[PDB]
Design a protein around this ligand. Structure first.
Ligand SMILES: OC[C@H]1O[C@H](O)[C@H](O)[C@@H](O)[C@@H]1O
Ligand SMILES: OC[C@H]1O[C@H](O)[C@H](O)[C@@H](O)[C@@H]1O
Ligand SMILES: OC[C@H]1O[C@H](O)[C@H](O)[C@@H](O)[C@@H]1O
Ligand SMILES: OC[C@H]1O[C@](O)(CO)[C@@H](O)[C@@H]1O
Ligand SMILES: OC[C@H]1O[C@](O)(CO)[C@@H](O)[C@@H]1O
Ligand SMILES: OC[C@H]1O[C@](O)(CO)[C@@H](O)[C@@H]1O
Ligand SMILES: [Cu+2]
Ligand SMILES: [Cu+2]
Ligand SMILES: [Cu+2]
Ligand SMILES: [Cu+2]
Ligand SMILES: [Cu+2]
Ligand SMILES: [Cu+2]
Lengths: 334, 334, 334
C-alpha cells in the first residue's frame, strides 16, 4: 500500500557511519537496511581474554543506521542457520510491538522484514530482546547498535542557526561480564549457551569486567584512532544499551550536546562531561581548536583506564598558543 | 491562625492516584492527609523470598499525595503501638526542619500533625528519616512515597500549550537488600531489628538483591498490568528515594518528560529513556498510538528482567500499520 | 607576547573560596595561581581509618580557583622532592594538550608553568592524570579540585535577571577505595606505592569504601558546619572527578541549578535533587527561608549516612510558621 520511493543503504562498520545527507530536499522514502546476526567468540582485551559475542552485522556495536524524520525504515533481519539462538530486533525509535521485537523473533535459518515510520528525531538504541532473562543477556553479549533520525532541515542550535558536522563517529559502549575462575583468571567458553549460567550469575551482581568501545580494549586507538583537523566540527554519537556512561573529550568540550539524544530538544552548550543513560544514545558536537592527541573516555576513570573505555583522536593542525601554552617547561624548583 | 477551607483526601494505594483536578479554580486550601505506618513481613518475588518491610499506609511505595501550588498540606502521621521502631516523615516538597523530619519523630503509640506550604511545583519524594544509619535503612525497607504539587493552571509544554493527562499512574521503584546464607539462599528474619545487621552490611556494598516496582516482582503485571487505550495521554510518575533509575516505555516514548520532576521547568520532548536521580521523583507523559503489550522498565535490563523492575501496560485499540508493520513474517532465508 | 595585567590569587582551603567579583568591570587579565602537590597519609573517618592521599595544596578537594571568561589562568604547579611520584594537572576548563596534562608532567623536585585561556564558562573539574592506570589512582587518591569561570556580567537566570550569591561554598566529593584484611578491618599502608596493588584491585570492582566531602567523614559538620542566615543566597559548587553523585539539601531546594555546571546554559529551577556526572562540577543556588540544621548529602542515603557523604548547614534567623509548622506535637493516638 505504501507507494514511496525505495533507497538502499550500504551499512558500514562502526565507528564509521554510512554516507547520508544532513539537510535534504528529499521527501519521505522507504530506506532499506539488512542486518545479519552473527554469534561468534572474540577477543576483547590485549591479554587475549575471549568473549561469547552476539552481534548485528558482525560488529559491536551494530552499525549506525541514518534516516530522516518521516522516512520509513525497512529492515531485513537475518538469523542464519549457523547461529544457535533465536533473536529479534527492537528499535527505540519505533512505535509499537515492543519497538519491533514482538514482530521480529526469528529462529536460526529465518529472516523477517519489519518497517517502522521514523516519527521521532534523535539518536536511539536498537537491540535484541528475545524475552525474559534473554533480554539482558543478548544485549550485554553485544546485540545493540543505534539509529539516527535527522530533521529534514538538518541539526540546529535551538536559536535558529544550523549546526552542520564535517564528520560523524559512532562510539558504542559495551558493558561485558566475563566470569573468573577460582584462581582469578577470566574464563573461556565453547558456546554462548555454555557461558550463560556463569555469565548470568555475574550479570546480576551489576559490575562489568570490561567496559569497551567498538567491542575491544583499545579498538579506537593506534591505526584505528578517530581523526580530525583543527577547524572541523565532529559529531560523536554515543550509545549504551544497558548501563550509564559519562562521556568526556579530554582536552576538548561538548560544544553542543544532546545527552538525552533527541533533536526536538535544543542542545546544551559548553559541557565538560555529559551523561548517557543506560538504554539510550546521545550526541555531542565539537569543533577542534588544537592539534594533538585527545582521549575520549567515560569519566569514571577506573572504567576508562582500567576496564577498557578509552578512545583516541589524533588531530592535525596548528597549535594555538593563545588558548594554551607551556610558559615554563619543567625545571628544578628554585 | 490559618483560616483557609479544609479538604480531606481519601488516599488510594499505588499505582493508582486519588482523584484530583489538574487545572483548578480553587484557591489555596488546607488539604488533609493521614498516613499510618505499618512494619510487616512481605513476599517480594515469585520464589517466595520474604522481606522485612516498613511502609506508609501499608504499601511500597507509599501512596501519591496530590495538591496544588500554594496549598497547605496537613499530614497526620500515625505510628501505631503494634510497630517496633520510631519513625518520622520528610517531604522533599517542603521547606524547613529537614523536610519535616525534625518535627515528626514519633514512637510506637504516637501520632503527630505537620503542615507545610506547597511552594514548589513538581513531583517529590517523601520518606522516613529517623536519624543516622536508620535513615537509609528505613528508606530501603520501603518507607518512601511521593507527592505531586500541580500548578493551578495545570501542566504546560513550556510553549504556552496545556498538557492534560487522561490518567496518571505512580510507579515507585524500590532497591532492596536481602542477604543470602552460605549456600546462597535468601535469608528470612523474624523482625526488622533481627534483619538489621545483615541487611546493613549488604547495603554498604551498594548492590541490591531486588529492584521492584510497587513492592514486588511482577506487581504491575497480569491482572494488575497498567492499562490505556490508543489516544489516551498517560502521565507516569516515577520515584526512587535512594538509587538512580532509567525509565523506558518499551514500544513507546516519553512525549513530554520532566526527568528532574519539577514543573517550573519545561519538559523535554520525544525521549527514549529518562533518568530518575536517587532521592527524586520525575514524570513522563505519553499518548498511546498502538495497542498491545508494552513493558515499562528501568533500562538497566539486568535489573529489569532479572532483579524485578518490569511493569506492563495492556493497551486497547486499533493497530496502525503506517507507524509499524511486519512486511514479511518469519520465513526461511532464500 | 601576552601583554595583559597580572593578578595574583591567594588560594584558600575548601570549602571556602578565595575572594572574587561576580560581575566585574575588569577586562581580561593573567590570573596567577600556585598549586603545591602533597602526598600524605591522612585519617578519613571517625574510627581512625588511614588513607594514602595525594593532594593539590594539601586538601581534598584541591582549592577552588575562580576567574572570569576570557582571563588567562597561569598556574605554577610544584612537585616538591619530598613526594615520591610524578604528577601533572588537567583542567576540564582548558583547550588542548589533554587539558594541560600533556604539558605539566613533573617529577619530584620540579615545577612547571601552564597558561590556558578561560573560553568556557561554568564550574569545571581539574585533576592529575599522569598516564594509563595512574590516572584513576591519582584522582581517587585525592588529586582533584575545581575551577569556576564566571561571566563578566555575573550569573543570570536565563530570563534576563541577575543571580547574585551572598556566599559560595565548594563541596568536593571523593570516592575512596580502602581495602580490608581477611578479618574485615581496613588496611593501612606505609606509602602510596605500597597501597597501590590492593587499592587498584578494589578500584576495579567499582565500589568505594568511603564517600566523603572535604576529605573526611564529618569534615563539614560541627565547628566546620557550613553556615547561612535566612535571606542569604548561597551558591554550592559540587564536584566529583570520578563517580556520579546526586546532591540534595535536606529541608531546602536547588532554587537555580546548573547540574551539568555550565553557565552558557540556563539553570533549572526548584529542584529537589540534582546530578553531578563523574568527571564534572555542577552548581546550585538556594535562598534560605528557615533557620536550623540542614544536611547536604548525596541522596544515595547509604553513601550519605553510612559511607561519609553528609555535610551540615547551621542557619540563623526566624522560623516561618507559614512555610511549615508542627500543628500538633507527638501525642498518644486517640
Ligand atoms: O528542529 C526542531 C525545531 O527546531 C527549532 C525550530 O525553531 C523549529 O522550527 C524546528 O521545528
Ligand atoms: O507554569 C509555570 C510557567 O509556565 C510557563 C508560563 O509561561 C508561565 O506563565 C507559568 O508561570
Ligand atoms: O550569560 C550568557 C548569556 O546569558 C543570557 C543572555 O541573554 C546573554 O546575553 C548572555 O550572553
Ligand atoms: O533545537 C530544537 C529546539 O529549537 C527550537 O525549535 C527553537 O528554539 C525549539 O522549539 C526546539 O526545542
Ligand atoms: O513549562 C514551564 C516553562 O514554561 C514557561 O513558563 C514558558 O516557556 C517557562 O518560563 C517555564 O520554565
Ligand atoms: O543563562 C544562560 C541562558 O540565558 C540566555 O542568554 C537567555 O535566555 C540564553 O541564551 C542562555 O542559554
Ligand atoms: Cu539476540
Ligand atoms: Cu530497549
Ligand atoms: Cu521509619
Ligand atoms: Cu530525602
Ligand atoms: Cu598525581
Ligand atoms: Cu578529566
Amino acid at each position: 500500500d505504501l507507494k514511496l520511493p525505495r533507497q538502499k543503504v550500504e551499512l558500514v562498520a562502526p565507528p564509521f557511519v554510512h554516507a547520508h545527507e544532513q539537510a535534504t530536499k528529499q521527501g519521505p522514502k522507504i530506506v532499506e537496511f539488512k542486518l545479519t546476526i552473527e554469534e561468534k567468540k572474540v577477543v576483547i582485551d590485549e591479554k587475549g581474554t575471549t568473549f561469547q559475542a552476539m552481534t548485528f552485522n558482525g560488529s559491536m556495536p551494530g552499525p549506525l543506521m541514518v534516516v530522516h524524520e518521516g522516512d520509513y525504515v525497512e529492515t531485513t533481519l537475518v538469523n542464519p542457520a549457523t547461529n544457535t539462538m533465536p533473536h529479534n530486533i527492537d528499535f527505540h525509535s519505533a512505535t509499537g510491538a515492543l519497538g519491533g521485537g514482538a514482530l521480529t523473533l526469528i529462529n536460526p535459518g529465518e529472516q523477517v522484514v519489519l518497517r517502522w515510520k521514523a516519527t521521532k528525531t534523535g539518536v536511539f538504541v536498537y537491540h535484541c530482546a528475545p524475552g525474559g532473562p534473554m533480554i539482558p543477556w543478548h544485549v550485554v553479549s553485544g546485540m545493540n547498535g543505534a539509529v539516527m533520525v535527522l530533521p529534514r532541515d538538518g541539526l540546529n542550535d535551538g536559536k535558529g542557526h544550523a549546526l552542520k558536522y564535517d564528520k560523524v563517529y559512532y562510539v558504542g559502549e559495551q558493558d561485558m561480564y566475563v566470569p573468573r575462575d577460582e584462581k582469578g583468571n577470566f574464563k573461556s567458553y565453547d558456546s554462548p549457551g555454555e557461558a550463560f549460567t556463569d555469565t548470568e550469575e555475574m550479570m546480576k551482581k551489576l559490575i562489568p569486567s570490561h567496559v569497551v568501545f567498538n567491542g575491544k580494549v583499545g579498538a579506537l586507538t593506534g591505526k584505528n584512532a578517530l581523526t580530525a583537523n583543527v577547524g572541523e566540527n565532529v559529531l560523536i554519537v554515543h550509545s549504551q544499551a544497558n548501563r550509564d556512561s559519562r562521556p568526556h573529550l579530554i582536552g576538548g568540550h561538548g560544544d553542543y550536546v544532546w545527552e538525552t539524544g533527541k533533536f526536538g530538544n535544543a542542545p546544551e552548550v559548553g559541557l565538560e562531561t555529559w551523561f548517557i543513560r543506560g538504554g539510550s544514545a546521545g550526541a555531542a558536537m565539537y569543533k577542534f581548536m588544537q592539534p594533538g592527541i585527545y582521549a575520549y573516555v567515560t569519566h569514571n576513570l577506573i572504567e576508562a583506564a582500567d576496564l577498557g573505555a578509552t578512545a583516541h583522536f589524533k588531530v592535525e593542525g596548528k597549535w594555538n598558543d593563545d588558548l594554551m601554552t607551556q610558559v615554563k617547561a619543567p625545571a628544578e624548583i628554585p
